[PDB]
Amino acid sequence: VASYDYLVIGGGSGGLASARRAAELGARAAVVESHKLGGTCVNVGCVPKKVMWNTAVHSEFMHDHADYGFPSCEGKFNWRVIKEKRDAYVSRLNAIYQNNLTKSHIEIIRGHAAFTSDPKPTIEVSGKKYTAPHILIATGGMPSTPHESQIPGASLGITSDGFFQLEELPGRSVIVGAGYIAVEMAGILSALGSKTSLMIRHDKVLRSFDSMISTNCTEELENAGVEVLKFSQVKEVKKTLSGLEVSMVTAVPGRLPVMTMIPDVDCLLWAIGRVPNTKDLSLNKLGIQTDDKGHIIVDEFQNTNVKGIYAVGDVCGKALLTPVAIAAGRKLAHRLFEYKEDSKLDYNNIPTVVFSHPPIGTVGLTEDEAIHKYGIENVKTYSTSFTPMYHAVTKRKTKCVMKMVCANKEEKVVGIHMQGLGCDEMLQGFAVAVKMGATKADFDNTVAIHPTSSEELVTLR
Template structure:
């Protein structure tokens, strides 16, 4: 059976591009189709532009802190159009790098939508059809928008990057990390922000103590957070948006942002027709080698709904190539993955929550809450919270959780220790770097509680 390609990748995000490029470097004939822009969610409408917005929004707090250190700071104003232009230019630059890397590796890229016509057949929206020995699905995910009256007046987390003007008042719906991050971003840019979440506390699935601490910190910074409530309808009224909650309360705002989760982008790809099993919600069911129920079809990244993070998708794409093209079977370990929530303050986490660890066996909890040195002169009452979850029997550090400035940077190195299986005594014999916030991670000697 003749094939046009050894591998055809559907989706030009981080996972798909990594797999295509590395496979091509082995000498394989590789094609890739992307219907929107190269770089996927992370580069175009996710991690990268979001982090640029995080940086921009953080300056308002920095200006306030500077006065406490003797700086005479003039009244500052944020220019959204100027920032947006620079942000767009940076995204275009990065997309160009993605395209250049694919071209340099010898990947044939198509700016078109691709669908499956069978286990080995790919059809493009241009009318072209190809046969591929292997097909990799890397189409990522898309924002979920609920069906309620007036939802057409709201925007999604994809749309927020392209706002024409910065709203004066915004309502953010959702309690996951995307909703919390954008609530903080808009708040830092000077927008009056209200956040609604139907659950009892934001960031479901994260450590309970840290969730409560972060919610308080966000409120202290100006986010008007309401939990246990949801939107019933959205109406246009006198040039504004009137949001009615399910408890009858009304909010009048200029923008409604829905960040209530994302769903795998599998609709209309022809997966089920080709025999691929999908999970509830549309995710591609895969085994530890990222292989679907059809032997020739694989999937990586958010479309599999395993651990929906860019570095995980990249790792899965590389492991796929090792397994299929280098005869070196590699399964990605999803059990210990460090992550950061870029709220203000930041939240970094790796390993088990206190709740999950408690269910697994006896544990010790070490924690420290304190005002960092920088906040004292700045006049801020905001407190850092650091927490270690330790197995009482093996002494292994099962989880590290940090809320405070630079938490995302700190958790990366903590992730190395947790992945290696470091014990509490390994942390204890590590000499502290003083004066830093991070030294608290190695100076907590007495457990605050056991369970």
């Protein structure tokens, strides 16, 4: 049993970030990874997704070419040209992160980890045992798929992972789900030329965001050509002579349910959720607590119910974002190796950007969350809706919507929500401001930058 000061199971964002900060503090650490370093962020998530979003953005700009005085570009998008460049980029990143581990003197144990029945917390990787007084589980999650028991032929569809393996643009695609991944995938596929349908159980997408955003995002999708199939779900999928045939039930409230067949579908993408990766860890051997979904339960300091064992990242099921896994992982390293017992991540006011078209930026409470928390009498919102100056000379149009949620007499800014061109790079700074407890007065006392879309947030009345 080789002993270390820190043993990290999982080589994705949470695992790498924590192991590296620990090593900086003098800890002898090792990272166990059964696949590719970089985890979801580098391999099947953030990075490849963003490259595809930049490609989709090129598509929209090509539509505005003639309006801006240029000749019209012909069209024919070549998927494998970008797929190949994207894969290469991911390869460069895997090499970079491996190098980052070596320079910090972090040992990389390649294989699948699983706990043993040994009294003191110990894991086994390919017949060898390893132990440490501090062990971090940062194994992440997977895309969830329906069981063939409830949805016959469900296994004919692909998940976000499968999306990154596609070597050709699907001519006809149906995305199932109403969360951010679904919206993002539908947005890229449609912009790139696929006949796209987004199938959602209710009437709007991103229903957990502020209502102004769910409403506006749903409309922008339709304006951009995406067919949103409302109150609809898949009943069954089957393989026909050319493509898949999807049977769906549409049940609009106050109407009779109707069955519809969607034929000649090239790509069915399930974007319905994420399942934690814990089933094969043998958690039970140490009695480590998990909820009924398989998420490891942790306290505010990322401690599990077992001493010396912690968890961060997607495996815990809360705030499933790369920067959150990273910050929690680093705060933990400082707590254990710099003895700062007050070191932990504040899960409040975590900013998020959804790479839709236009992108969405959000931080803080939605209007409904502020109302519940402070009371209708104490919540004041400010909003604006305008057409960005970029579209002043174009036939194609998009809108920019912004909303500020203030609380109490001082009008403390407790939430900012927006969708529009440039919102992806606009959010970070306002998030710093909200994290500092800015009031509407602080925003108003900052001189605006003209001409930009961002100046609208400091000139709301």
